[PDB]
Amino acid sequence: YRYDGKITNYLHKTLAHVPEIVERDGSIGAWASEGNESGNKLFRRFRKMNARQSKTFELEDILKHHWLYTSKYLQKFMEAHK
DNA sequence: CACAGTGCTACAGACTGGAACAAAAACCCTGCAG
Numbered sequence: 001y002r003y004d005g006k007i008t009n010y011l012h013k014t015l016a017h018v019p020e021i022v023e024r025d026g027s028i029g030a031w032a033s034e035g036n037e038s039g040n041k042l043f044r045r046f047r048k049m050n051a052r053q054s055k056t057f058e059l060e061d062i063l064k065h066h067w068l069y070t071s072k073y074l075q076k077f078m079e080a081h082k
Numbered sequence: 083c084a085c086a087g088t089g090c091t092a093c094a095g096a097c098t099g100g101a102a103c104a105a106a107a108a109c110c111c112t113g114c115a116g
Contacts, residue, residue, distance in 0.1 A: 050089085051088065052088055053087095053088050057088095057089080057090085058088090058089095061088095061090095
């Protein structure tokens with residue numbers, strides 16, 4: 001009664017092409033939007049605490065500081081070999 | 083005349099060196115004193 005002439009784009013996509021995708025790639029959730037999307041959170045705390053802050057400069061500094069946050073070289077120091 | 087900042091800038095402040103001055107510290111000394 002609810003699916004006669006209408007289906008959500010996703011119920012279709014997830015009931016149809018997934019086997020083909022994971023045959024093609026072998027992974028989906030690894031390619032998920034999360035890495036981008038989640039990241040937005042950081043952007044917000046970078047537009048507040050580490051911003052310049054005036055319209056001209058601040059994008060530069062959010063960007064720079066973001067790049068530093070996400071570098072490996074820094075993160076290696078976290079465990080500090082345990 | 084809200085206030086803790088907001089990073090990167092600005093160049094203010096922190097440094098040497100010999101050449102020599104001066105003052106002061108705390109000894110030794112000699113001076114003039116009972």
